């Protein structure tokens, strides 16, 4: 793991300078394609993309797990919905499946801790049947968190061998917006009230209890904000650890990863804390309608491309943004050049 | 034309209620897909879509024309760039061509007033070789504006006969952000300084002159804010009139039209002034990086889906958003339902 983190490559400044020069000469006023230009240059710098913005195969990794904190009444969805939806992921009927299919991406469903019998068709990496209730103790041991990070990291970079060059990250886990809020509060130093949202339609009257649970989780566990693994193991969850793992693996592999919503922002804060070198590889997708989204994004210094008021999760936002990544590549490789049309601009 | 405007259909509330009921029953917490859900319902209500959100063929119509106000020094791009780029549109090397191809849409390039010899391959609907310099008089006569609106309107709804169900609108015309700003100022009652931007990289020192030209245009022509055709003919341009025409035609046809950037917002303000019934058919794409974008959008009560800091024009933003429209349709027709998985949520 220390080796893993140590070997994450820095972005290639040489390929990026070459990319910038090429974009400036395309058939348009310099800088007019804005964030599409910046995105193309960002991609050119990722070593796994071989010096040029390009997209080969695409995969969305959905980390599934249950949470003991569900018993504190912080979620209205029945606990079994995690297991049921994970099965639906194998049938192609969920939101991320439909949006991934539209983008030509494949969905990998990974069970890292569902509290139910194993589901055929789902990748089995389960740590336990649900994590510990963070309101009274830790979600898991540090050892468990580190081992899951490594296993998911390896699985992720292995896909790079099969032609995958663009990843999307997602989750499935009833009650997971509670540990997500705890993590965001700890990493950003923001009060729980400012980052606890309604998740999957929690009634406005049940919010107070959710905020209290988050504060108790932090008070009892005393997670160290400077140690991302300490934070994940104490007030996180297996799904959150798994998402962080996809990010470290894509980075080690020198490839881009598209974030999704609030849960993924929590995982990204942990990933960047653990290894700042991961940052250049993350690409935001949409601006989640979850209350703590603005704060988490400000700490990651990220501005999403899509404002869709989405809050489903599952990696649906990440899938929705894949066409945008392909568009930056299309602009780069297919547009004509000013000089060829004899156009000279100041 | 009066007939045209009179026959624009109202949205079908019955199809929309049926759409809403179906979306609420899909495999996700109610309302969790946010604006994707609202977009799907909006589409269900457009009569030309036959009661359901769907997308058949797609077309981006690019209106090209030159402006006499170019002589006032409000643009750094050579005048010939309009003609050169229009030709490039037929070769598939421009920004909108590349992005339209990525979205599976076809680009129709229409010459409504380029100051050059006719370009083979471009649809010829030219009114004149460039419009009048709005700084000293009107861009065109009311008769010319009305006739172009009708001709473009008919061309647009005719495409509906060929299977097109989704339109995108764009423009090509050096110096056109000047009449666009004049129109926005007149329709919104905002001062020219608040809506005049740098267009295609105008130097910061040349801005003052651009603002003065816009004020002179308004003072000399005295366009009536309550008469959109009066406004277009006096301080608009052939390209602006053409874009307004695509919007009236799509509306008459009961089909959706995706806006692009600032120029298209100007045209949409005119279209909605002329016939408020056009409003339900417009769909925003991106939030243009042009200075007056925020004001124009607030008056149209529109919130774009994409924040890409784009300012190229050509209909590039509209093309970039087509996948989002297809995504709302995919969600609607392909997602599974809660009842089939025996999931019951409060």
From Swiss-Prot, chains A, B:
A molecular function GO annotation: nicotinate-nucleotide-dimethylbenzimidazole phosphoribosyltransferase activity
Keywords: Cobalamin biosynthesis, Glycosyltransferase, Nucleotide-binding, Transferase
Biological source species: Salmonella typhimurium (strain LT2 / SGSC1412 / ATCC 700720)
Residues at which substrate binds: 85
Similarity-based family: Belongs to the CobT family.
The protein's annotated pathway: Nucleoside biosynthesis; alpha-ribazole biosynthesis; alpha-ribazole from 5,6-dimethylbenzimidazole: step 1/2
Note: In vitro assays of this enzyme are performed at pH 10 because at physiological pH (7.0) its activity is undetectable; this makes it difficult to assess the role of mutagenesis of potential proton acceptor active site residues (Glu-171 and Glu-314).
One annotated GO biological process: cobalamin biosynthetic process
Site keyed Important for substrate positioning, might be proton acceptor: positions: 171, 314
Phenotype upon gene inactivation: No growth on cobinamide (CBI); double cobB-cobT deletion mutants do not grow on CBI and DMB.
Database matches in InterPro entries: Nict_dMeBzImd_PRibTrfase, Nict_dMeBzImd_PRibTrfase_bact, Nict_dMeBzImd_PRibTrfase_N, Nict_dMeBzImd_PRibTrfase_sf
Pfam family, one: DBI_PRT
Record's subunit section: Homodimer.
Catalytic reactions on record: 5,6-dimethylbenzimidazole + nicotinate beta-D-ribonucleotide = alpha-ribazole 5'-phosphate + nicotinate + H(+)
CDD domains named in the record: DMB-PRT_CobT
UniProt EC number: 2.4.2.21
Protein name: Nicotinate-nucleotide--dimethylbenzimidazole phosphoribosyltransferase
Signal peptide: none
Annotated function: Catalyzes the synthesis of alpha-ribazole-5'-phosphate from nicotinate mononucleotide (NAMN) and 5,6-dimethylbenzimidazole (DMB). Able to use a variety of other nucleotide bases as substrate to create alternative lower ligands for cobamide.
Gene3D superfamilies assigned to the protein according to its UniProt record, in alphabetical order: 1.10.1610.10, 3.40.50.10210
């Amino acid at each position: 793991l220390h080796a893993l983190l140590r070997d994450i490559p820095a972005p290639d400044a040489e390929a990026m300078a070459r990319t910038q020069q090429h974009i400036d000469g395309l058939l348009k006023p310099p800088g007019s394609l804005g964030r599409l230009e910046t995105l193309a240059v960002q991609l050119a710098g990722m070593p796994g993309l071989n010096g040029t913005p390009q997209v080969g195969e695409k995969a969305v990794l959905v980390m599934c797990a249950d949470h003991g904190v569900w018993d504190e009444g912080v979620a209205v969805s029945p606990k079994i919905v995690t297991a049921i939806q994970a099965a639906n992921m194998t049938r192609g009927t969920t939101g991320v499946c439909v949006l991934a299919a539209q983008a030509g991406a494949k969905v990998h469903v990974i069970d890292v801790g569902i509290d139910a019998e194993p589901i055929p068709g789902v990748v089995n990496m389960r740590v336990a049947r649900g994590c510990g209730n963070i309101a009274v103790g830790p979600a898991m041991s540090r050892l468990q968190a580190e081992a899951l990070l490594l296993e998911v990291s390896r699985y992720t970079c292995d896909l790079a061998q099969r032609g995958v060059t663009l990843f999307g990250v997602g989750e499935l886990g009833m009650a997971n917006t509670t540990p997500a809020a705890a993590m965001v509060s700890v990493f950003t130093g923001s009060d729980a009230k400012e980052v606890v949202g309604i998740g999957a339609n929690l009634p406005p009257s049940r919010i107070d209890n959710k905020v209290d649970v988050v504060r108790r989780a932090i008070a009892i566990n005393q997670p160290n904000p400077r140690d991302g693994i300490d934070v994940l193991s104490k007030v996180g969850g297996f799904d959150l650890v798994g998402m962080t793992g996809v990010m470290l693996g894509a980075a080690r592999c020198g490839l881009p990863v598209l974030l999704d919503g609030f849960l993924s922002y929590s995982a990204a804060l942990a990933a960047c804390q653990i290894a700042p070198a991961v940052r250049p590889y993350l690409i935001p997708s949409h601006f989640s309608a979850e209350k703590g989204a603005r704060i988490a994004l400000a700490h990651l210094s990220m501005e999403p491309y899509l404002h869709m008021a989405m809050r489903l999760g599952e990696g649906s936002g990440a899938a929705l943004a894949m066409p945008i990544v392909e568009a930056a590549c299309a602009m780069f490789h297919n547009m004509g050049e000013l000089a060829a049309s004899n156009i000279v601009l100041p």
